[PDB]
Paper text:
The fusobacterial trimeric autotransporter adhesin (TAA) [name] binds to [name] on immune cells, resulting in downregulation of their activity against tumors colonized by [name]. In contrast to Fap2, [name] is a homotrimeric type Vc autotransporter protein, in which all three protomers together form a trimeric passenger domain that remains exposed on the cell surface after expression, and a C-terminal β-barrel domain that serves as a membrane anchor. The ECD of [name] comprises an N-terminal, membrane-distal immunoglobulin variable region-like (IgV-like) domain and three membrane-proximal immunoglobulin constant region-like (IgC2-like) domains IgC2-like A1, IgC2-like B, and IgC2-like A2. [name] binds to [name] via a protruding loop (D142–Y149) and via H92 on the respective adjacent protomer chain.
We therefore formed the complex of nanodisc-reconstituted [name] and [name]-ECD (residues 35–428, ACRO Biosystems) and removed excess of [name] by preparative size exclusion chromatography (SEC). We then vitrified the SEC fraction corresponding to the main peak and resolved the structure of the complex to 2.7 Å, applying C3 symmetry. The structure revealed a heterohexameric complex in which one [name] is bound per [name] protomer, with the N-terminal IgV-like domain of [name] and the region around the β roll protruding loop of [name] forming the interface. Each [name] protrudes perpendicularly from the central [name] trimer and sits atop the β roll protruding loop of [name]. Four residues of the eight-residue long loop 142–149, i.e., E142, N144, Q146, and Q148, form H-bonds with side chains of T90, Q78 [Q44 in mature chain (11)], and Y68 of [name]. In addition, there are two further H-bonds three β strands “above” in the stack that are formed between H92 and N99 of [name] and the backbone of S127 and D128 of [name]. Importantly, H92 originates from the neighboring [name] protomer, and both together form one [name] interface. Instead, a tight interface is formed exclusively by the peptide moieties predominantly via H-bonds, whereas only two hydrophobic surface-exposed residues (F63 and L129 in [name]) are buried in the complex. The rest of the [name] side of the interface appears slightly negatively charged, whereas at the [name] side of the interface, positive charges dominate. Our [name]/[name] complex structure shows that [name]-F63 is in close proximity to H92 and F143, which probably form aromatic stacking interactions.
Residue numbers in the entry:
A (entry chain B), C (entry chain A), D (entry chain C): 26 to 274
B (entry chain E), E (entry chain D), F (entry chain F): 35 to 234
């Protein structure tokens, strides 16, 4: 029968059946819960809180570091100030978070929000630092940092930093780029405001801007294309006289 | 209890082997096959996820391995490097792992052997000529066939270097016959050329 | 008075007042909690855990499937491997997640992070598969899949796949497009790196690139615009002689 | 020794050691937990639930309003229908959420997903309404609303509305803009579909479109550049006669 | 207890009806009005959210329905198709739903009626002439008026087809007067043209 | 117990002051220094975060303050406006705040003073001439010096305006010597030019 009793440390509480509480001011409530560190809490079924100030709430959750939260089902938060929320999320980095299902985050100050895959091991993981993924089945290789993904099936290889991937099945192939598609599917960017055609502006021109061409360098373009200006074509400027007289008598 | 069974246990090189799984738990989350006796992420060959019904090759995959919905693993183009232990990881509905193991041996295609004599013309009254099958291969079994019948066990028939060398302590003209030796491994066996004795 | 006692199944725990635990290795801690399936936990006030390995932690939470997490207030996670975290979040899809307030996710492998609206029914819901919305009051119609939203008041109609919406009050009207604004408000894209003007490059040209025109096809442009190259003008190439002699005598 | 007993209100439960439950149908489970409002739950170690229907689960969590959830470690959800999940997250807004570590959200209907910084005070906070941040160490000033950030080290000043920032170290300097970089680092946009060159289209032209120039206004461009069409140059159209006859005799 | 009251209960076609709400709970989260006796998401007419103070029309909305902060529902341009039950859902602060119901009937603008007789010249000594109001419409009430006075009940005044048809079993010359009939519903009624008897 | 100690307690203007921290807890999460006796977010000078090892200035920072890894605060180019209390916030591993206070005084560098007399030619037999050090300054200590030895206490040596005005009640020709005034503060002190009497 369930019982309430003190654990093996001062102010340690065991509530339920087959509970173990070993840390000072720790508590294990439920069935088969273990709270082994100081001020650690394990509430639910089969949870393990093996780090100080760590809490595992739910079903078969594991928290292992100085401030770890594993809330949900089969989450493993093994990282300082790390949080694993959802279903079967493993966070192994420092100050990293993960929300969703079957996602692993081994990078530092990284995050993931979506669904990955776990057959017997995590097939899609976040191994980059300061990188975030929102989508399904996304990969970031180790050594690729400061990368952001908003899409599905986006795999980032090694040595790709400061990159953003947007949309389903997007592809990143270089650093300091924003990708809105792959070599097979290319997306249009619609509803773009007019650019700032000028010498030094870094904007995005639109269809109407290039259609009309307002604000272009009328002098630079007249050198790249050898343009006979109508003013000269009217005033006979810059012609040969020993040559025109030949064909024209 | 989870048990795996190789089919067949001994496979000729370049053939395929199929690992069967028995007593698979009713409620499952997915499978995974690992090379070696350990379960390590670096050794994962292939993995299946019943939920999404997806089979994903692992880092140890070489393109010759396919997993089946009934947890079976098929390896095509087996090579002698594949001989070893394989472990199956079964993840139940509550996500508690269950483990099993299986193994198979790969053996090469043994050719015709050949025989040599260190005395071409045995002396009729008595001689100590020795017979040996030259093409040395590992982990094979040899056996000698005389007048196309199995050799009669006798101290007169000496065997050296295991029994790859057959030495005849005292030959006689009545022993003239076709000498012919075999090599056999668990997977195959086939013959050399009969060798005769020369007397007069 | 609160009591600790066994439930109706083996290793089932009831802690508090008016609790019901019916699953094996289940536990109901708090007030008016029901845990009816195997290894299901309901901790808090008025929680319901009606699925195996499901946990409902908080206030009036409902978990109904094989791995369901409803953490917060009035969350209903009715979906396999589905998580509903926050206030009044309903997840009805497979492996789908939701964090925030008053959001519903009926799609498969979908997610929502933000605030919706619930007067008596969910007014803003995610009904698309493999789709994610981050923002306030966002809608994705059923049959529109692989869509991503980063903005507020973005409604996606039927038959719109592989689309990305960015910013407040953005509008998506077609598939395989990235939308930056609506027909009324059009945003500029600033701080864009220089493109890769060439025959096959798919980049985004900038204001300076269109201003200077470096790298354009100087031969193709000279056919679309019937220019008269200064070399031919100065050398009388490509002229008529029978009728130029007429006007010029 | 731990004890199970009634609180100071009807159907109030205290489980553990040194617990206080004062609200009707409230419960405090663990060590040093206080549930002071009606139907408020405090499960874990040192949690405080001072608002109705509020739940604080974990370690040193505080919930203070009518529907507040503080799940994790040292979270403070002080806002109506507000949720603070993770490590040391403070949500002070209305219907706002925060997931991650050391992030503060004081805006209304806002959110943050990532990591900030907390030395003795929150150094990076979301002060804008209807604004969302995903990344590390991002700032939104008060009065700047409807802003979205996908990146790190992005600080948005005052009076900047309807803006989107993408990528690491991005910079926003105006309203109704989308920024993909700063004045120092500028990102390219790759894999862009072909635009819709026309009179009124608002698209993004690509490198090939500007290279070939197909679909441009062949008549408008021929006025801005005073080209001499071969149809006239060969045909002697539009020339002076009193002046050509002078130099050409 | 939550009660709703239509105002008025019977509405003329094309008019408006207002549903009042009484004993509304103290702490509320929002309201919702559903068409029919059930609360189904497909039948939601309109919904209010006190928190953000927004009134979002539902799938069943037709543009004629407005919700008010004190939970009353106003339906303008009412039609005969609107006759039915309406349920109000009230969500309290703890988000536990409370339910009520209300109904009203829509009736048409009943027009000018007319009368007919199958004998134009009653026989003075005796006749069995019948009087009937032709313009048949549903769920009305009929009553007859003779000599500017409600008909005196007698077996001599026969009624058929309910009592839209007035048959005079035995007429007399003393019965000459203006015959005039009414067709009447809960919302409106106005009179026909007097019909005289012809005798000599 | 957390204690802070200013070093030095009294600082001349434009110099630097270093606040030491003692008995710092073993397990820490970060520090913060606030101006004034209160801990307010608007008064934060600087903060340190041991985890990420970042030192972030606060709203009250002026560019003259640096935080050391051992929680000491260094303030360079100090001004008279900085005189006040400072509080140190220490956040332990469990994130329970611990507070301590410290203070220092800023004083100006006082110059050469100067002396004045109302009577240039004291009368030899007797006079009541008064000496005064004119350059008035706040919170400082005044010291007189006669024939380079400290003034011998006597009712003869009257003092006025506190003791910046020295009145000689009944002068004599034997009192002739150097008269010199000293203006000193907690941080500095230097002297004036000796003054003499004229007698004959
Ligand atoms: C698994 O599938 C393969 C092909 O269908 C089959 O050959 C094998 O017999 C199956 N294994 C079992 C135990 O039935
Ligand atoms: C099998 O393996 C050998 C060596 O890699 C290769 O040459 C051969 O083509 C393979 N045959 C098949 C059917 O895979
Ligand atoms: C027979 O000998 C040949 C070549 O000498 C070899 O390729 C083959 O594997 C052998 N087959 C068997 C059944 O031993
Ligand atoms: C060679 O053959 C002769 C036959 O008399 C025999 O004596 C001898 O042992 C043989 N040598 C070897 C190495 O077998
Ligand atoms: C003897 O004859 C043939 C070889 O030509 C062989 O196949 C057969 O098996 C031999 N007899 C026995 C008992 O092996
Ligand atoms: C030949 O050697 C093997 C070694 O295991 C042995 O099993 C076999 O009995 C031997 N045969 C004879 C005839 O000695
Ligand atoms: C609700 O609002 C309308 C307009 O203010 C009003 O006519 C109606 O009486 C109100 N309901 C009640 C019960 O007062
Ligand atoms: C009322 O209903 C009829 C039928 O739709 C429509 O023609 C009429 O314009 C409506 N009047 C108003 C004020 O809506
Ligand atoms: C009155 O009679 C006229 C003529 O048919 C009709 O249009 C109208 O609806 C009637 N009004 C009422 C209140 O019965
Ligand atoms: C019509 O009036 C005559 C008068 O005699 C009467 O006989 C007859 O019953 C009436 N017909 C009908 C259908 O009421
Ligand atoms: C008699 O005639 C008038 C209309 O002509 C009618 O309004 C009135 O009601 C009738 N008399 C009575 C008592 O109803
Ligand atoms: C006329 O018809 C209705 C039917 O319900 C009846 O109530 C009413 O009394 C009838 N009037 C006479 C005079 O029969
Ligand atoms: C604190 O750090 C600085 C830098 O080394 C040092 O000058 C100071 O003495 C340190 N204080 C103590 C008590 O060690
Ligand atoms: C100190 O402050 C004064 C006035 O602000 C300034 O002139 C001086 O340059 C400063 N000295 C240093 C070393 O910063
Ligand atoms: C000495 O007096 C001078 C100016 O007269 C001043 O600059 C200085 O600060 C003083 N130094 C001390 C130690 O009092
Ligand atoms: C000025 O000096 C004279 C000397 O006789 C003395 O009488 C007088 O008190 C002094 N007055 C002041 C204001 O010091
Ligand atoms: C006497 O003379 C010198 C200055 O001339 C001074 O430094 C010294 O301290 C004086 N002696 C005393 C006891 O003050
Ligand atoms: C000079 O002024 C201060 C004021 O506190 C006093 O302490 C000191 O004793 C005075 N010196 C004499 C000789 O009076």
């Amino acid at each position: 029968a369930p019982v309430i009793k003190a654990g093996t440390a001062t102010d340690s509480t065991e509530a339920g059946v087959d509970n173990v509480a070993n840390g000072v001011k720790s508590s294990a409530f439920g069935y088969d819960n273990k709270a082994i560190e100081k001020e650690s809490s394990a509430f639910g079924t089969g949870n393990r809180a093996t780090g100080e100030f760590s809490s595992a709430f739910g079903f078969h959750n594991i928290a292992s570091k100085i401030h770890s939260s594993a809330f949900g089902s089969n989450n493993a938060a093994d990282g300082v100030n790390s949080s694993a929320f959802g279903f079967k999320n493993t966070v192994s980095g420092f100050n990293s978070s993960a929300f969703g299902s079957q996602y692993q985050v081994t990078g530092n100050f990284s995050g993931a929000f979506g669904m990955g895959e776990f057959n017997g091991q995590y097939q899609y993981k976040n191994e980059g630092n300061n990188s975030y993924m929102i989508g399904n089945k996304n990969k970031i290789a180790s050594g690729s940092d400061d990368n952001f993904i908003l899409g599905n099936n986006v795999h980032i290889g090694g040595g790709i930093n400061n990159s953003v991937a947007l949309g389903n099945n997007s592809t990143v192939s270089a650093s300091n780029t924003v990708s809105v598609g792959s070599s097979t599917l290319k997306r249009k960017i619609v509803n773009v405001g007019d650019g700032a055609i000028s010498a030094n502006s870094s904007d995005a021109v639109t269809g109407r801007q290039l259609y009309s061409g307002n604000g272009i360098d009328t002098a630079a373009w007249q050198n790249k294309l050898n343009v006979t200006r109508k003013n000269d074509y009217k005033d006979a400027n810059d012609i040969d006289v020993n040559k025109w007289k030949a064909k024209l008598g | 209890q989870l048990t795996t069974e190789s089919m067949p246990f001994n496979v000729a090189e370049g053939k395929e082997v199929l690992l069967l799984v028995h007593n698979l738990p009713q409620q499952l989350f997915g499978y995974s096959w690992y090379k070696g006796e350990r379960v390590d992420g670096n050794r994962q060959i292939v993995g299946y996820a019943i939920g999404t019904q997806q089979a994903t090759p692992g880092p140890a995959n070489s393109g010759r391995e396919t997993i089946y919905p009934n947890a079976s693993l098929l390896i095509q183009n087996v090579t002698q490097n594949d001989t070893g232990f394989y472990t199956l990881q079964v993840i139940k509905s509550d996500l508690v792992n269950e483990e099993a193991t299986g193994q198979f041996h790969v053996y090469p295609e043994l050719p015709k052997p050949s025989i040599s004599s260190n005395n071409s013309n045995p002396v009729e009254d008595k001689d100590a000529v020795a017979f040996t099958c030259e093409p040395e291969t590992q982990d094979t079994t040899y056996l000698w066939w005389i007048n196309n019948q199995s050799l009669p066990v006798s101290p007169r028939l000496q065997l050296s270097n295991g029994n790859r060398t057959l030495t005849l302590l005292s030959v006689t003209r009545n022993d003239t016959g076709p000498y012919e030796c075999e090599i056999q491994n668990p997977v195959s066996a086939n013959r050399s050329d009969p060798v005769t004795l020369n007397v007069t």
